[PDB]
């Protein structure tokens, strides 16, 4: 059939597009995933960095 007739997408389309309704709920999840990953990638770094500090039996002999 003709290429100018588009197939049906009515089972996946949102009734009210509201340009900032897919722009608010999509980006809130991408921001939350970067907030938790910037806090998790920091507790990791400072956990390895603190192993190089003085140990328990060196502080006792201070």
């Amino acid at each position: 059939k003709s290429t100018y007739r588009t197939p049906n997408f009515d089972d996946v389309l949102k009734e009210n597009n509201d340009a900032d309704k897919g722009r608010s709920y999509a980006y809130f999840m991408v921001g939350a995933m970067g907030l938790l990953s910037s806090a998790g990638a920091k507790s990791t770094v400072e956990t390895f960095i603190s192993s190089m500090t003085a140990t328990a039996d060196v502080l006792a002999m201070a």
């Binding site: 956990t47 390895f48 603190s50 192993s51 328990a56 039996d57």
Partner: protein, 110 residues
């Protein structure tokens, strides 16, 4: 052209992890090879930080691993992440190899 395509060092990154063409139908069994690259980074990093406190003499070796687990700050996290990390490294490799054995990835031209 874009800078990621013209620079000598970024061109390799672009060709491998950005613009590399992939088949659309590959499933989650094709994700095990990236995990094995994370396993190797975990095992190497945690080992450098324990090696600063280790002693390899046969009369000092066992008691040095207990010194890591009692006196070193966050030392029990380093070791257990290391000892259990190697068991996870081998389990992902058995799944990687059994994948290639199922889908025929060993055949020509690979």
């Amino acid at each position: 052209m874009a800078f990621r395509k013209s620079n000598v060092y970024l061109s390799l990154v672009n060709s491998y992890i950005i613009d590399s063409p992939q088949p659309s139908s590959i499933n989650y069994w094709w994700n095990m090879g990236s995990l094995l690259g994370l396993c190797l980074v975990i095992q190497i990093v945690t080992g450098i930080f324990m090696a600063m406190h280790y002693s390899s003499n046969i009369e000092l070796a066992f008691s040095s691993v207990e010194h890591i687990m009692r006196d070193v700050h966050n030392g029990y996290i380093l070791r257990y992440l290391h000892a259990n990390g190697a068991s996870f490294f081998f389990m992902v490799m058995f799944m990687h190899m059994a994948k290639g054995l199922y889908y025929g990835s060993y055949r020509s031209p690979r």
